[PDB]
Amino acid sequence: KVEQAVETEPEPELRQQTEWQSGQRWELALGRFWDYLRWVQTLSEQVQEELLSSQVTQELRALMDETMKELKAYKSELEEQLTPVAEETRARLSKELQAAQARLGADMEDVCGRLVQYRGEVQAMLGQSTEELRVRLASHLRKLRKRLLRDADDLQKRLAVYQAGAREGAERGLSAIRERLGP
């Protein structure tokens, strides 16, 4: 159930048109946050002043707000359709998209939570060691930035195929939205 050479039959152009029709709306919000959240990877003195307070946490909070506002806004419109497939390709992407959306949102939500978490324990001591917290945060956060990156890119592929929209076959296919669990 993969679009390897079977999609090139029904005209693979649908993939090229979708990428352009995407609009880069939702991809813009997250895209700008992708570099922002990953920027904290520095773990340098800069993170010490950003973590000590609700700085980094404040930023990440917005990132999840935009990507969620843009995704839900575009998702609703796409709800009227369900990619020009709905057979064997859409079925597979249906479950994949649901897993990608829950991932990006899960990892991103864990990022802000981890920062504020590791901070509370750090600020509780301060006078104590400064490496133990630097080695941990760098590691824990590292996994959050890595996975989130893989989920973000994968989520763009699924959401890209959903933006295509069929026409009549989708007009009666609420399955798409039914899986999105959104308005």
Swiss-Prot record:
Residue ranges, annotated region (LDL and other lipoprotein receptors binding): 140-150
Phenotype for L144P: Decreased binding to LDL receptor
GO molecular function: amyloid-beta binding; antioxidant activity; cholesterol transfer activity; enzyme binding; heparan sulfate proteoglycan binding; heparin binding; identical protein binding; lipid binding
Tissue: Produced by several tissues and cell types and mainly found associated with lipid particles in the plasma, the interstitial fluid and lymph. Mainly synthesized by liver hepatocytes. Significant quantities are also produced in brain, mainly by astrocytes and glial cells in the cerebral cortex, but also by neurons in frontal cortex and hippocampus. It is also expressed by cells of the peripheral nervous system. Also expressed by adrenal gland, testis, ovary, skin, kidney, spleen and adipose tissue and macrophages in various tissues.
Residue stretches of each Sequence repeat: 62-83, 84-105, 106-127, 128-149, 150-171
Region (8 X 22 AA approximate tandem repeats): 62-183
Consequence of substituting R145C: In HLPP3; also found in a patient with hypercholesterolemia; ApoE4 Philadelphia and ApoE2-type
Subcellular location: Secreted; Secreted, Extracellular space; Secreted, Extracellular space, Extracellular matrix; Extracellular vesicle
Reported disease: Hyperlipoproteinemia 3: A disorder characterized by the accumulation of intermediate-density lipoprotein particles (IDL or broad-beta-lipoprotein) rich in cholesterol. Clinical features include xanthomas, yellowish lipid deposits in the palmar crease, or less specific on tendons and on elbows. The disorder rarely manifests before the third decade in men. In women, it is usually expressed only after the menopause. Alzheimer disease 2: A late-onset form of Alzheimer disease. Alzheimer disease is a neurodegenerative disorder characterized by progressive dementia, loss of cognitive abilities, and deposition of fibrillar amyloid proteins as intraneuronal neurofibrillary tangles, extracellular amyloid plaques and vascular amyloid deposits. The major constituents of these plaques are neurotoxic amyloid-beta protein 40 and amyloid-beta protein 42, that are produced by the proteolysis of the transmembrane APP protein.
Subunit structure: Homotetramer. May interact with ABCA1; functionally associated with ABCA1 in the biogenesis of HDLs. May interact with APP/A4 amyloid-beta peptide; the interaction is extremely stable in vitro but its physiological significance is unclear. May interact with MAPT. May interact with MAP2. In the cerebrospinal fluid, interacts with secreted SORL1. Interacts with PMEL; this allows the loading of PMEL luminal fragment on ILVs to induce fibril nucleation.
Physiological role: APOE is an apolipoprotein, a protein associating with lipid particles, that mainly functions in lipoprotein-mediated lipid transport between organs via the plasma and interstitial fluids. APOE is a core component of plasma lipoproteins and is involved in their production, conversion and clearance. Apolipoproteins are amphipathic molecules that interact both with lipids of the lipoprotein particle core and the aqueous environment of the plasma.
Designated name of the protein: Apolipoprotein E
